C-alpha cells in the first residue's frame, strides 16, 4: 500500500461510467434532482469504504427564472410594438429535446425590471473599456442599456462596472470571436458554440462572502438573515445573456461613434459601433428588457466524506469540488466530480485492505457553487475553527478538462515542488510523448516564463470553491486540469461553457473519448492528496514562497516606479518590503536545513505545524480594504476580474489609476500604509519559521 | 525538581529587596529612568539563567505635561481675575521632597485648551448618572464643565460619557467617600489619601487597539501612522484630576438643583448641588481649565525572557506584567514586578541544576501599560501568529497586593480547577489560619455566591495587560492578588492608587511588612505558571466552561425577559443559545471521559491542542460591533466600564436601554442577530472538543 497502489487502482473506464451517470438530467442547485444526486453520492461513498459520509445542508439565497413569465429582450418601435424578441430557450441538443427542467438562459441574481432605452456597446465591459468610453470617447452610459461581450473577465465585474457607469441594464452575449474556434463545427457536430447557445452564470460581487444574507456565519436553521436591501453582492440593474444570433440583431442597427480600434470588434458582420442608439432610420427604436427572475432562500446540500487518519487524525487534507450544474454539467462540474468519485473509490479499496492514510482525508461534493461558491463557503464558515487549526491543504476538483493539449496547474508556491515531483512520476497521456513523463510533456508544451526546463504554474485566482479555504482561511490550496493550447486558440475557457450543449456526448465525442486525460487529472489530483495525507514531513517547500515573494515585490515596485516624482514627494519607499522578503528568504533557507537535519515526533510535528501554519501566516485578520473576506495579504482575486489572482493586492489596488485621484497626498499615504502592512505580514510569516524558542 | 522545589525557592526577603530596588526613583513610560530599569531587568534575567532575554521596542503615542507651562484649574471672577487655583503638584512624601522628575498630576492624552464655564456635578459620570441628569432632572450638560468623582468605573468611560453629553471639559477628583477609609490616617501616618493627593491616569477609549496611531500592526520602525485626527481613542475635551482639598473649593459654591438622592453625596462638607453654576452671590464667577499637555511619539521597551521547553518548546506559557509606573510604583506595578523577578530567579535556579519545563515559559516586563496597555498590545500585534497557534496561557502580574485580607482571582473558567487545586496545596499566610490551606482561608473569607464550600472567582474585565491575550487573541488568561475586605470597606481599589504616595514605605509599613502576602501571591502566580508549563495534560477543565455558559445564558435571557411584549412581537427566542450550551455541556463531558481514558503522545497532544484551542474557539474574527479588537464572544470589557467584564457582551449591548430606541423592530432584530452569533460560537467551540475524525 503506497502511492503506486493508489494510482494503479484508478480506471479511465470508471470515470467514464460515473460521468455518464452524473449527466443524464440537470442538477441545478436547490432542485430535487440535485438533492437526489447528493443522496446517491453519499450512499456510494459509504459503499466505497469511507468512515462517515454526511450531508451538511444550509438555506441560502438562490435565483431562478419565473416559469410562467419568461425573460427576454425586445427591440421596440416608437408605437411600443416589440418587433424583435430574443429566444426563450436554447434549442436542446439531439435526444434531449424532451428533457424537462432545463433552466432557460438567465443571469442569476438579476433584479426584476423592464428598462427601455438606447444601447451602448462597451466591448468586454472591463475597467479599461469604461475608461476608454468616458475619458477618451466622452460617451456617457448614464441611463443607457449596455451591451457587452462575454470574455476576458468575470461577468460579475462587468455588471459592477456597468452599474458604476450609470447603466440601467446589461445585456451579455457570446461573440464568435471569443467562443467559436476557426475551422471547428458547432455542437452537435463539433465543440463550438452555435448561434442559439447561451452562457448562464451568476452576476454577484460577493468578494468571498458566501450566502448574500449571512456573511460571516453559516446559513443554518436559526441564522439571522439580512434583509434583501442589505444583502451582499446583489446587482442593482437587470441583466440577461443571449447568443450571437440574437446579438447580431441587437448590434446590426447600432449608430453613434465608430469602435475606437480593432480590439473592440468581434467577428459578427456588424460595425461594432459604440452608440448610443441606432442609426438614423431606426433612431426612434429602443431596446427593452423583461426580467422577472426571483431570489429565493433555498436548501442546498454538501456531501462530506471522512477517511480517518491512522497517526494524525486531527490533520485534514481536503479534496473538494462541486456537484450542482447549470444544466447537464458534462464538463462543469461532472468531469471533475466523476474524477473525485473514482479517487474516493480507490482510497476506499486500500482502506478495505487495512490501509489508512497518515492524516485524515475529507472529501466534499459542494452544492450551489454556480450561485457564488455558496456550499463550500457556508460549510467553511460553520467549520472555520476546525479548518483554521487543523487544515493542511485543499485540492479543488471542478472540471477535469477544458481541452486535450496539456496540464494546467494553479496553486500556492508551497505546492510547486510536490507538483514537479509528482508529475515526473506520472505517464504522459499525450500523443508523441508515449513513454515520457507528464512533467516532460507539460514542460515542453507550457514552459515557465522564468525558468528553463520548468513548467508554468499560475497563481490561484478565484471563481471556484478553493476561495474560502485559500483567501479567507489561509489553507494551502491547489488545482489541476487538462487545457487547450493557449497560443493557437484565442477564445479562452471552452466554447460550450454553461450552455445546454455541455453534455456527456460533448466530452466522449470531442474531448476525451478514451478518458485518458480524465485519468491523468485523477492521478494528479489524487496523487497530490495522497502525498499531502501520507508523507511523514508535509510536502511543502517554504523556499518556493521566498522566490515568488521577490518576484511579486519587484513587480509592485515597478508599478510604483511609473510615478517617480510622487515617490520622491511623498517619500514612498519599498525598502521595508524588500527587507522582509530578504529575511523570509534567509529564514526559510535555515528552516529547510533543520527540516532535513532533524527519530523525534514532536520536532517533526512541531516542524509539520510550522509548515502547515506558514500559509496561515499570510492571513490578516482585518482583511483587505472593504473586502473583509479576502484576508490573504499576498494573493487576492483581482478587484477588476474575480477569476484572476493579483499579488500584493492591497498595494496593487492602492496604486491602481492613482494619477486620477483628486488628493494625491492621501492616495500615496494609502500606498505607504499598504507597503507597511505587506512588509509586516511577510516578516511575521518568516518569523513563524524561526526556531520556536 | 517538582513544583514543591520551585515554590520552596521563592523567598519573601528577595521580593522585599526587589521592591525596594524598583521604587527609589520614578519609572514613567518613555523616560530614561524606565529604559535603564529595562536594561537592569534584562541583565538580571540573563544572570538568573534564562535562555534568551531581549528588549522589544516600539514608538508609540504617549502624553506628558508641559514642564514650563503647568496644568491647573481656576475659579475666575467676572473681571477675569483667577481667585483660586488648584495645586501644581502633590506635596511630596517625607524624604522625597528632593526627588526630581515626579510627573505632576494630569490626565494622559487630554487635548490642550483653556475652556471657561459653569460647573455641573455629575456624580461618578456613569451612564446611569447621565441618564438621571438629562432624562429625570432635565439638566443639560452642553457647553458646561463637568466635575465627576473618581470611582465605580474606568475614568476613560467617564470622559466618553461627558463628551457625549456635550461637556466642554471634565474635572476628576478623589472624594473621601471613595478614597478615605474611616478610622485610618492619611499618608505618611496611614494608608489613606491626603487632601493634596491626586490620582493620575489615562483617559483613552482604545477598546483594545493599543497604540492610538497603529491599530492592528506593531509600531515598529517602518510603521505607517494615522494622523492625530484619525487616532484611536483620544478625548475631544480637556480633562484634569485634582484632590479633595481643591475639589471642596470648586464644589462649595455650587448652586442650581439639589443632588437627586444620597447616592450622589460624597463625604465633603458641601451640598453636592448639581448646578449648573454657583449660588446667587457667586453666579458670575466661572471655572477655567488650563491644559497644555502634549501627545508625542516616544520609544518604549518591553523585556522578553525565554525559558525553552524540553518537550514542547513550541507551546508558550506567558507570565507578564508591566514595569512603567506613574511615579514610584510602590504597589502599581512594582509589587507585581518584584514578584515576577523572584519567580524568574526561582525557575532559573532549577534550570541551573539541569531542569527545564515541559513547555516554553515566556516572561515579560511590559512598558507603557499606564498609557493604554501599549507595550503588551504592540508586542502581541507583532507576534500574533506565534501567539495564536502556540499560546497556551497568559498569567498577568500587576500589583500583588491592594489589601491584606484575602486572595482575589479573576480568570477564564478553564483555570478554575487549576486554581482550586493549587490553593489547596499552599499555606495560608492569614492570621488565625496558621497551618490551614490558602484554599480554606480564601473560601472562608470570599465564598462563592453560587456554591457552598467554594471560593469566589471573577470574570476577567480589562484595564490590564491580559486584554490583548484574552479578548483579542483568545488565549486562556488569569490573574491573582491579595485584596481588602470588600464588605467592611466601601472605598474600592486602594486609596493611594496612582498618587506620589504609592511608595516602598507604604507597602513595607502598612500593607505587608513581612512580605508574606507577596510570597503567597508569588506562589499562586508561579504555581499556576509551573503547572501550565509542566503538566503532561494541560490543566484546563472544559466542563467548568459549560457550567458558566449556562449561568450567562440564564442571565442574558432574564435581561431580555424584562420585555415580554417585544419578545412576542419580534419572535425573540433564546432556544438556539440554550441548545448550544446544552450541546457544549454534553460534548465537554464526553471529551473529559476521553481525556482520562486515553502511552500515545499524538493522542495526548491532539487532546492538548483541543484544550489549548478551546479558549481560541470563542474568538469571532469579525469582532464585536464597532469594537474590532474585542473578539471574544463570551467576554468583553463592559461598554460602560472597561474594568468590569460583561458576559455575552454582544447580546448585552444590543439589549441595553433598548426601550429608548426609536426603531424597536431594528433594535430587536439586532438582539436576534447577536443571539445567533452567540449560539453559533458556543456550538462551534463545543465542536472543537468532538472527536476529530
Ligand atoms: C529583517 O531582519 C533584520 C534583522 O536581521 C531586521 O533588522 C532590524 O532592523 C531594525 C530596523 O532597522 C533595527 O532597529 C534598530 O534597533 C536599534 C536597537 O537595536 C535602535 O537603536 C534603532 O533605532 C535608532 O535608529 C533609527 C534609524 O536611524 C532611528 O529612527 C531611531 O530613532 C533610533 O535612533 C533601530 O530601531 C533592529 O535593531 C534590527 N534588528 C536586528 C539587526 O536584529 C529587520 O527589521 C527585518 N526587516 C523587517 C521588515 O522586519
Ligand atoms: C445541538 O446538537 C443537536 C444534535 O444533537 C443539533 O441538532 C440538529 O438540529 C438541527 C436543527 O433542528 C436539525 O436540523 C434538521 O435537519 C433535518 C435533516 O436532518 C431537516 O429536515 C430539518 O429541517 C426541516 O424542519 C425544519 C424545522 O421545522 C424546517 O424549518 C425545515 O424547513 C425542514 O422542514 C432540520 O434542518 C438537525 O438534524 C439536528 N442534528 C442532529 C440531531 O444531529 C442542534 O442543532 C445543536 N444546537 C445548535 C445550536 O447547534
Ligand atoms: N491554459 C489556459 N490558460 C489560461 N490562462 C489564463 C486564462 C484567463 N481567463 C480565465 C482564467 C480563469 C478562469 C476561471 O478560473 N474560470 C472558472 C469558472 C468556474 C465557474 O463557472 N464558476 C462560476 C461561479 C463563480 C463565482 O461565483 O465566484 C462562474 O464563474 O459563473 C474556472 O474554470 O474555475 C476564467 C477565465 N485562461 C486560460 C485558459 O482558458 N487556458
Ligand atoms: N476584593 C475586591 N473585589 C472587587 N470587586 C470588584 C471591584 C469593582 N471595581 C474595580 C474592579 C477592577 C478594577 C481594576 O481592575 N483596576 C485595574 C487598574 C490597573 C490600571 O491602573 N490600569 C491603567 C491602564 C488601564 C487601560 O488603559 O486600560 C488605568 O486604569 O489607568 C487593575 O487593578 O488591574 C478597578 C475597579 N473592586 C474590587 C476590589 O477593589 N476588591
Ligand atoms: C447512477 O448510478 C446509480 C448507482 O448505481 C443508480 O442508482 C441505483 O439505481 C438502482 C436501479 O434503479 C437502484 O436499485 C439503486 O438503489 C440505486 N443506487 C443508489 C441510488 O445508490 C442510478 O440509477 C444511476 N443514474 C442514472 C441516470 O443512470
Ligand atoms: C415579442 O413578444 C411579445 C410578447 O409576447 C409580443 O407582443 C404581444 O403580442 C400579442 C399578440 O399580438 C399581444 O396580444 C400582446 O399584447 C403583445 N405583448 C406586448 C408586451 O407587446 C410580440 O408580438 C413579439 N414580437 C415578435 C416579433 O415576435
Ligand atoms: C522533490 O524531490 C526532490 C528530489 O528527490 C526532493 O529533494 C530532495 O530531498 C531529500 C530529502 O530531504 C534530500 O536528501 C535531497 O538533498 C533533496 N534533493 C534536492 C533538493 O535536489 C524534494 O524534497 C521533493 N519535494 C517534495 C515537496 O517532496
Ligand atoms: C538595583 O539593583 C541593581 C542590581 O544590583 C543595581 O545595579 C547595579 O549597581 C551596581 C553598583 O552601582 C553595578 O556595579 C552593577 O553593574 C549594577 N547591575 C545591574 C544594572 O544589573 C542598582 O544600583 C539598584 N538600584 C537601586 C536604586 O538601588
Ligand atoms: C492663579 O494663577 C494665575 C497664573 O499665575 C495668577 O494670575 C497671574 O498673576 C500675575 C501676578 O499678579 C499676573 O501678572 C498674570 O497676568 C496673571 N495671570 C493670569 C492668567 O491671570 C493668579 O494670581 C493666581 N491666583 C491665585 C489666587 O493664586
Ligand atoms: C484537580 O484535582 C482533582 C482531584 O485530584 C483532579 O481530579 C481527578 O483527576 C484524576 C486524574 O484524571 C482522576 O482520576 C480523578 O477521578 C479526578 N477526581 C475528581 C474529578 O474528583 C483534577 O483533574 C484536578 N484538576 C486539574 C486541572 O488538574
Ligand atoms: C411569476 O409570474 C406569474 C404569472 O405572470 C405570477 O403569477 C407569479 O407571481 C410569479 N412568480 C413569482 C414572482 O415567484
Ligand atoms: C451623464 O448623464 C446624466 C444626464 O442624463 C448626467 O446627470 C451626468 O452627470 C452625465 N455624466 C457625465 C460625466 O457627463
Ligand atoms: C483534441 O486534439 C486534437 C489534435 O490536437 C485537436 O485537433 C482538437 O481540437 C482537440 N479537441 C478539443 C476539444 O480540444
Ligand atoms: C511648553 O510651553 C512653553 C512655554 O510656555 C512653550 O515655549 C513650548 O512650546 C511648550 N512645549 C511643548 C508644546 O512641547
Ligand atoms: C442643550 O443646550 C444647547 C443650547 O446651548 C442645545 O443646542 C441642545 O439642543 C440642548 N439639549 C437639550 C437636550 O436640551
Ligand atoms: C492589615 O490588616 C489589619 C488587620 O485586619 C487591618 O487593621 C489593616 O487595615 C490592614 N492594612 C491594610 C493596608 O489593609
Ligand atoms: Ca454565511
Ligand atoms: Ca499597533
Ligand atoms: Cl479545479
Ligand atoms: Cl494582576
Ligand atoms: Zn464549476
Ligand atoms: Zn460553472
Ligand atoms: Zn499597573
Ligand atoms: Zn496603574
The C-alpha of A416 sits at a distance from chain B's nearest C-alpha, in angstroms, of 24
End-to-end Cα, chain A, rounded Å:
38
Question: Do the beta carbons of residue B577 and residue B682 sit within 8 Å?
Answer: yes
Contact at CB, B216 and A676, closer than 8 angstroms: no
Of B502, B500, B368, B372, nearest in space to B88 by CA: B500
Please give the torsion angle defined by the CA atoms of residues B371, B376, B379 and B382, in that order, rounded to the nearest 10 degrees. -90
Grid cell, residue A558, equals: 515597478
**Among A539, A563, A592, where does a domain finish?**
A539
End-to-end Cα, chain B, rounded Å:
38
Helix (H) or strand (E) run with residue A669 in it: helix A664-687
Spell out which residues have Cβ within 5 A of ligand 22, the ion.
A 332
Partners of A295 in the β-ladder:
A63
Residues A144 and A279 in one domain: yes
Complete DSSP assignment for A313-339: EEEEEEEEEE---SSS-TTTTHHHHHH
Question: Do the beta carbons of residue B218 and residue B263 sit within 8 Å?
Answer: no
DSSP E strands, A77-235: 82-85, 107-108, 116-117, 119-121, 145-149, 169-173, 201-202
Residues B584 and B516 in one domain: no
Resolution (A): 1.6
Grid cell, residue A566, equals: 510622487
Asked if the C-beta of A578 comes within 8 angstroms of chain B's C-beta atoms, the answer is: no
Query: Three-state SS across A443-481?
Result: HHHCECCCCCCCECCECCCCCCCCHHHHHHCCCEEEEEE
Query: B21: Cβ below 6 Å to ligand 8?
Result: yes
B450: domain CATH number is: 3.40.630.10
Residue B20 CA, closest ligand 8 atom number:
28
CA A415, CA B463: separation in Å to the nearest integer? Answer: 45
Residue B683 CA, closest ligand 2 atom number:
50
Of B272, B284, B296, B265, nearest in space to B120 by CA: B272
Q: Measure CA A226 to chain center.
A: 26
Residues A442 and A494 in one domain: yes
Grid cell, residue B225, equals: 501612522
Grid cell, residue A167, equals: 447603466
Question: Do the beta carbons of residue A630 and residue A623 sit within 8 Å?
Answer: yes
Helix (H) or strand (E) run with residue B322 in it: strand B312-322
DSSP E strands, B122-221: 145-149, 169-173, 201-202
Query: B488: Cβ below 6 Å to ligand 14?
Result: no
A149: domain CATH number is: 3.50.30.30
Of A197, A198, A202, nearest in space to A212 by CA: A202
Residues B182 and B304 in one domain: no
Beta-carbon count within 10 A of B568 CB: 9
CA B292, CA B642: separation in Å to the nearest integer? Answer: 27
Q: Which three-class secondary structure state does DSSP give residue A610?
A: helix
Helix (H) or strand (E) run with residue B483 in it: strand B476-483
Nearest CA to ligand 16 atom 2: B404
Residues A484 and A353 in one domain: yes
Contact at CB, B669 and A224, closer than 8 angstroms: yes
Q: Write the CA distances from A342 to A361, A504, B263, integer angstroms.
A: 15, 17, 76
CA A199, CA A260: separation in Å to the nearest integer? Answer: 27
Question: Do the beta carbons of residue B205 and residue B627 sit within 8 Å?
Answer: no
Residues B654 and B505 in one domain: no
Number of domains within chain A:
3
Residues B60 and B78 in one domain: no
Beta-carbon count within 10 A of B450 CB: 10
The C-alpha of B295 sits at a distance from chain A's nearest C-alpha, in angstroms, of 22
Question: Do the beta carbons of residue A176 and residue A266 sit within 8 Å?
Answer: yes
Residues B396 and B331 in one domain: yes
Residue A66 CA, closest ligand 11 atom number:
1
Find the length of chain B.
693
Q: Write the CA distances from A435 to A422, A438, B107, integer angstroms.
A: 16, 9, 80
CA B118, CA B231: separation in Å to the nearest integer? Answer: 30
Q: Which residue of B has its CA nearest to A691?
A: B314
Query: Three-state SS across A70-84?
Result: CCEEEEECCCCCEEE
The C-alpha of A672 sits at a distance from chain B's nearest C-alpha, in angstroms, of 7
Of A25, A33, A31, nearest in space to A63 by CA: A31
- DSSP state letter for B122: -
**Cis status, amide bond into A188, omega within 30 of 0:** yes
Grid cell, residue A434, equals: 508515449
CA A427, CA A447: separation in Å to the nearest integer? Answer: 18
**Among A523, A539, A555, where does a domain finish?**
A539
Radius of gyration of chain A (CA): 25
Residues B583 and B515 in one domain: no
Residues A391 and A486 in one domain: yes
**Cis status, amide bond into A339, omega within 30 of 0:** no
Distance B293 CA to ligand 14 centre (A): 9
Percent helix, strand, coil in chain A, to 5, is 40, 20, 40
Q: Which residue of B has its CA nearest to A53?
A: B693
Full domain range(s) for residue B247: 66-291
Spell out which residues have Cβ within 5 A of ligand 17, the ion.
A 210-211, 214, 219, 381
Question: What is the biggest distance separating any 2 CA atoms in chain A, rounded to whole angstroms?
Answer: 87
CA B341, CA B335: separation in Å to the nearest integer? Answer: 10
Please tell me the number of the ligand nearest to residue B540's CA: 10
List, in order, residues 6 or more apart from A440 with CB less than 8 Å away. Answer: A428, A433
Contact at CB, A616 and B390, closer than 8 angstroms: no
A624: domain CATH number is: 1.20.930.40
**Among A481, A506, A539, where does a domain finish?**
A539
**Cis status, amide bond into B518, omega within 30 of 0:** no
Nearest CA to ligand 1 atom 29: B221
Grid cell, residue A319, equals: 479534496
Helix (H) or strand (E) run with residue B64 in it: strand B52-64
Please tell me the number of the ligand nearest to residue B88's CA: 9
Contact pairs from chain A to chain B, CB under 8 Å:
118
Q: Which residues, numbered 303 to 322 in chain B, qualify as contacts with chain A under a Cβ-Cβ cut-off of 8 Å?
A: 306, 308-309, 311-314, 316
Please give the torsion angle defined by the CA atoms of residues A553, A557, A558 and A564, in that order, rounded to the nearest 10 degrees. -170
Grid cell, residue B71, equals: 496644568
CA B335, CA B507: separation in Å to the nearest integer? Answer: 8
Complete DSSP assignment for B605-657: HHHHHHHHHHHHTTB-TT-BTTBTT--BSSEEEETTEEEEEEESHHHHHHHTT
Residues A322 and A464 in one domain: yes
Query: A67: Cβ below 6 Å to ligand 11?
Result: no
Question: Do the beta carbons of residue A503 and residue A93 sit within 8 Å?
Answer: yes
CA B380, CA B367: separation in Å to the nearest integer? Answer: 13
Question: Pairing mode, if any, of strands A107-108 and A116-117?
Answer: unpaired
CA B332, CA B328: separation in Å to the nearest integer? Answer: 9
Nearest CA to ligand 5 atom 20: A40
Buried b (16+ CB within 10 A) or exposed e, B327-340: bbbbbbbbbbbbbb
Of the partner residues A309, A628, A675, the one whose CB lies closest to the CB of residue B693: A309
Q: Measure CA B627 to chain center.
A: 17
Question: Pairing mode, if any, of strands A286-290 and A201-202?
Answer: unpaired
Asked if the C-beta of A384 comes within 8 angstroms of chain B's C-beta atoms, the answer is: yes
Residues B109 and B16 in one domain: no
Complete DSSP assignment for A570-598: TT---HHHHHHHHHHHHHHHHHHHHHHH-
Question: Do the beta carbons of residue A307 and residue A363 sit within 8 Å?
Answer: yes
- DSSP state letter for B41: H
Grid cell, residue B426, equals: 499552599
Which residues of chain A are within 8 Å of residue B628 when distances are taken between CB atoms? 622
Of B635, B628, B651, nearest in space to B685 by CA: B635
Angle CA(B427)–CA(B432)–CA(B437) in degrees, nearest 5? 20
Asked if the C-beta of A421 comes within 8 angstroms of chain B's C-beta atoms, the answer is: no
Amino acid at each position: 500500500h503506497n502511492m503506486k497502489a493508489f494510482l494503479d487502482e484508478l480506471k479511465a473506464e470508471n470515470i467514464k461510467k460515473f460521468l455518464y451517470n452524473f449527466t443524464q438530467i440537470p442538477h441545478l442547485a436547490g432542485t430535487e434532482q440535485n438533492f437526489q444526486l447528493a443522496k446517491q453520492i453519499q450512499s456510494q461513498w459509504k459503499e466505497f469504504g469511507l468512515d462517515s459520509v454526511e450531508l451538511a445542508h444550509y438555506d441560502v439565497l438562490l435565483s431562478y427564472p419565473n416559469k410562467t413569465h419568461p425573460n427576454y429582450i425586445s427591440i421596440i418601435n416608437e408605437d411600443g410594438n416589440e418587433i424583435f424578441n430574443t429566444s426563450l430557450f436554447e434549442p436542446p441538443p439531439p435526444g434531449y429535446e424532451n428533457v424537462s427542467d432545463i433552466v432557460p438562459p438567465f443571469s442569476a441574481f438579476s433584479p426584476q425590471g423592464m428598462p427601455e432605452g438606447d444601447l451602448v456597446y462597451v466591448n468586454y465591459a472591463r475597467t479599461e473599456d469604461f475608461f476608454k468610453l468616458e475619458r477618451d470617447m466622452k460617451i456617457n452610459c448614464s441611463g443607457k442599456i449596455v451591451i457587452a461581450r462575454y470574455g476576458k473577465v468575470f461577468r460579475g465585474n462587468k455588471v459592477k462596472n456597468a452599474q458604476l457607469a450609470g447603466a440601467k441594464g446589461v445585456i451579455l452575449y457570446s461573440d464568435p470571436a471569443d467562443y467559436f474556434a476557426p475551422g471547428v463545427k458547432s455542437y452537435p457536430d463539433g465543440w463550438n458554440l452555435p448561434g442559439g447557445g447561451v452562457q448562464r452564470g451568476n452576476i454577484l460581487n460577493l468578494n468571498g462572502a458566501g450566502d448574500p444574507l449571512t456573511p460571516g456565519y453559516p446559513a443554518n436553521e436559526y441564522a439571522y438573515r439580512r434583509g434583501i436591501a442589505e444583502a451582499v453582492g446583489l446587482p442593482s440593474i437587470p441583466v440577461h445573456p443571449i447568443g450571437y444570433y440574437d446579438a447580431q440583431k441587437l448590434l446590426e442597427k447600432m449608430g453613434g461613434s465608430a469602435p475606437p480600434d480593432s480590439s473592440w470588434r468581434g467577428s459578427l458582420k456588424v460595425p461594432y459601433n459604440v452608440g448610443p442608439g441606432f442609426t438614423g432610420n431606426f433612431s426612434t427604436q429602443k431596446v427593452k428588457m423583461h426580467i422577472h427572475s426571483t431570489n429565493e432562500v433555498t436548501r442546498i446540500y454538501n456531501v462530506i466524506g471522512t477517511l480517518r487518519g491512522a497517526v494524525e487524525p486531527d490533520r485534514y487534507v481536503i479534496l473538494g469540488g462541486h456537484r450542482d450544474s447549470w444544466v447537464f454539467g458534462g464538463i462543469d462540474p461532472q468531469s471533475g466530480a466523476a474524477v473525485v468519485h473514482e479517487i474516493v473509490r480507490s482510497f476506499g479499496t486500500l482502506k478495505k485492505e487495512g490501509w489508512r492514510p497518515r492524516r485524515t482525508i475529507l472529501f466534499a461534493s459542494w452544492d450551489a457553487a454556480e450561485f457564488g461558491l455558496l456550499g463550500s463557503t457556508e460549510w467553511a464558515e460553520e467549520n472555520s475553527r476546525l479548518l483554521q487549526e487543523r487544515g493542511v491543504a485543499y485540492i479543488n476538483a471542478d472540471s477535469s478538462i477544458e481541452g486535450n493539449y496539456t496540464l494546467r496547474v494553479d496553486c500556492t508556491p508551497l505546492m510547486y515542488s510536490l507538483v514537479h515531483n509528482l508529475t515526473k512520476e506520472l505517464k504522459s497521456p499525450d500523443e508523441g510523448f508515449e513513454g515520457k513523463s507528464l512533467y516532460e510533456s507539460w514542460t515542453k508544451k507550457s514552459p515557465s516564463p522564468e525558468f528553463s526546463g520548468m513548467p508554468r504554474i499560475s497563481k490561484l485566482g478565484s471563481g471556484n470553491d478553493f476561495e474560502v479555504f485559500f483567501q479567507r482561511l489561509g489553507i494551502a490550496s491547489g488545482r489541476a486540469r487538462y487545457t487547450k493550447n493557449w497560443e493557437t486558440n484565442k477564445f479562452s475557457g471552452y466554447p460550450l461553457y454553461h450552455s445546454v450543449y455541455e453534455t456527456y456526448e460533448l466530452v466522449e465525442k470531442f474531448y476525451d473519448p478514451m478518458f485518458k486525460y480524465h485519468l491523468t487529472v485523477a492521478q494528479v489530483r489524487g496523487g497530490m492528496v495522497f502525498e499531502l495525507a501520507n508523507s511523514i514531513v508535509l510536502p511543502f517547500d517554504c523556499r518556493d514562497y521566498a522566490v515568488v515573494l521577490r518576484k511579486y515585490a519587484d513587480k509592485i515596485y515597478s508599478i510604483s516606479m511609473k510615478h517617480p516624482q510622487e515617490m520622491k514627494t511623498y517619500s514612498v519607499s519599498f525598502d521595508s518590503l524588500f527587507s522582509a522578503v530578504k529575511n523570509f528568504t534567509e529564514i526559510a533557507s535555515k528552516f529547510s536545513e533543520r527540516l532535513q537535519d532533524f527519530s523525534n515526533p514532536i520536532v517533526l510535528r512541531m516542524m509539520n505545524d510550522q509548515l502547515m501554519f506558514l500559509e496561515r501566516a499570510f492571513i490578516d485578520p482585518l482583511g483587505l480594504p472593504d473586502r473583509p473576506f479576502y484576508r490573504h495579504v499576498i494573493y487576492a482575486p483581482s478587484s477588476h476580474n474575480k477569476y484572476a489572482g493579483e499579488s500584493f493586492p492591497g498595494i496593487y489596488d492602492a496604486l491602481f489609476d492613482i494619477e486620477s485621484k483628486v488628493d494625491p497626498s492621501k492616495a500615496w499615504g494609502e500606498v505607504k500604509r499598504q507597503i507597511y502592512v505587506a512588509a509586516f505580514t511577510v516578516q511575521a510569516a518568516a518569523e513563524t519559521l524561526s526556531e520556536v524558542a
